[PDB]
A paper describes a structure:
One of these resistance mechanisms entails the enzymatic cleavage of the macrolides’ macrolactone ring by erythromycin esterases (Eres). [name] is an extremely close homologue of EreA, displaying more than 90% sequence identity. Crystal form I, determined to a resolution of 2.0 Å, has one molecule per asymmetric unit, and crystal form II was resolved to 2.4 Å and has two molecules of [name] per asymmetric unit. Both crystal forms show that the protein can be divided into two parts, a major and a minor lobe. The major lobe makes up the greater portion of the protein and is composed of 8 β-strands (β1–6, β9, and β12) forming a continuous sheet, surrounded by α-helices and loops.
We determined the three-dimensional structure of [name] [name] in two different crystal forms. However, there is a notable difference in a loop between residues 295 and 303. In crystal form I, this loop is folded over the rest of the enzyme, and we have designated this the closed configuration (EreCClosed). Not unexpectantly, electron density corresponding to erythromycin could not be explicitly identified in either of the two structures. To examine the binding of erythromycin to [name], flexible docking (Dock v6.9) was used to build a model of the EreCClosed-erythromycin complex. The rationale behind utilizing the closed conformation of [name] for the docking experiment was because of the higher resolution structure, providing greater confidence in the position of the amino acid conformers. However, it was found that the closed conformation of the loop was actually compatible with macrolide binding, and it suggests that the closing of the loop can be important for catalysis. Upon examining the docked structure, we were able to see that erythromycin sits snugly in the active site of EreCClosed with the interfacial surface area of 633 Å2, as calculated by PDBePISA. Upon the binding of erythromycin, the flexible loop of [name] closes over the active site, positioning the ester bond within the vicinity of residues H50, E78, and H289.
Numbering used by the authors: 11 to 418
The structure:
């Protein structure tokens, strides 16, 4: 009664909506539903995401999708979705990491929206997934020029101070960050704090009608830059030295903040969050070099509205695409290589799926029932937690092959 074999999950065009009825109670009253992935860059996880987007959109009226990219990165993706009059390939509207993480789903979404006539809001809930603050600072400088020109030299100094942060991924940008002198780093961090406090102090004036929503956009840009610099500082310790336990919660708390603000600002929004299992999880995550981090989902599970749900995706394959770091010569500082996935053990969610659904097709299970499962695959490893508290449901596909458009 709490599990279901789904034969159509990997076939979004031939979906049998009866197979997802098990989710209808948990999705009622939800305004935020996360669709996970146990590993990035997996073809089957993009397929399952497209199917569950169909279910949430067509049967529960979800109307927005949030991605692990920045707000400006996402506006370009929105241009892609809405375009048609010319050569409008996704490569023209996306950066390399965004393309590999979401390209397959994004190409499908555009067709789906055109053919179905439906409409969805795209939202970047993240920092720039490059950790390059250039776009944010450039938009801030244009806004500030209009609404608070007195502080425009300060924004332009910041732009110059941070011009060398131009990577296409966190590992590249963080390496460029570590090449700056400590005093220039702290001067930039202090510069952003000065700007943040000035803008908040002037809010009653800058919210005047002639400025439209420019105060809000400036405030969002500054927040994005502030957390980008702190995440660059952390990413540096997270390999090159003294990473403090819990520090990797900072980026995920930014994401939780963007989602929370967006939902309470727009009360009709019902958003589907496309993020990793480790980000959607509602309990503390222990993984790789982090003894314990607080995930985005644990913040969102705090909402008094109790309207967040998290669906983890896992798989029964013997291998999984993994990120290989370091990877000298690779354009983004890492590569994606097929590697053996973590062994399935008796107290694993994977074994429960095998015991419940079998191994023939995919499986969908709720987590609120006594069970032996305490660990679940994540990348080529596993995380251990209380899975009834950590996720609301689990989606498990038969295999996890590298997505064919991923070029890393």
């Amino acid at each position: 009664m709490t599990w279901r074999t789904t034969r159509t999950l990997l076939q979004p065009q031939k979906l049998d909506f009866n197979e997802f009825e098990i989710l209808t109670p948990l999705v009622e009253g939800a305004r935020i539903v996360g669709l996970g992935e146990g590993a990035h860059f997996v073809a089957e996880f993009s397929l399952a995401r497209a199917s569950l987007i169909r279910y949430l959109v067509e049967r529960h009226d979800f109307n927005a999708i949030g991605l692990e990219c920045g707000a400006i990165q996402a506006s370009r993706l929105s241009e892609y979705l809405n375009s048609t009059a010319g050569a409008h390939e996704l490569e023209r509207f996306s950066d390399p990491l965004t393309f590999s993480l979401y390209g397959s789903v994004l190409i499908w979404i555009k067709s789906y929206l055109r053919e179905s006539g439906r409409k969805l809001q795209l939202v970047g809930i993240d920092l720039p997934n490059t950790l390059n603050p250039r776009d944010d600072l450039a938009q801030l400088a244009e806004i500030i020029k209009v609404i608070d020109h007195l502080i425009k030299p300060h924004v332009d100094e910041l732009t110059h101070l941070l011009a060398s942060i131009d990577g296409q991924s966190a590992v590249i940008s963080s390496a460029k960050w570590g090449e700056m002198e400590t005093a220039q780093q702290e001067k930039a961090i202090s510069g952003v704090t000065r700007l943040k406090l000035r803008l908040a102090s002037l809010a009653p004036v800058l919210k005047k009608h002639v400025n439209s929503d420019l105060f809000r956009k400036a405030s969002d840009r500054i927040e994005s830059i502030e957390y980008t610099l702190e995440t660059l500082r952390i990413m540096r310790t997270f390999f090159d030295g003294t990473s403090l336990e819990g520090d990797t919660s900072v980026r995920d708390s930014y994401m939780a903040g963007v989602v929370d603000r967006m939902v309470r600002a727009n009360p009709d929004v019902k958003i589907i969050l496309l993020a990793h299992n480790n980000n959607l999880q509602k309990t503390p995550v222990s993984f790789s070099g982090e003894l314990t981090a607080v995930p985005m989902g644990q913040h969102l599970a705090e909402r008094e509205e109790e309207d967040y749900r998290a669906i983890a995706f896992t798989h029964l394959g013997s291998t999984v695409p993994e990120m290989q770091f370091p990877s000298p010569g690779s354009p983004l500082g890492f590569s994606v290589v097929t590697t053996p996935a973590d062994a399935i053990r008796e107290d694993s969610m994977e074994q429960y799926i095998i015991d419940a659904c079998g191994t023939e097709d995919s499986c969908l299970t709720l987590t609120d029932a006594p069970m032996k499962a305490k660990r679940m695959r994540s990348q080529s490893a596993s995380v251990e937690t209380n899975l009834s508290e950590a996720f609301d449901a689990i989606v498990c596909v038969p295999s996890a092959g590298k997505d064919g458009l991923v070029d890393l």
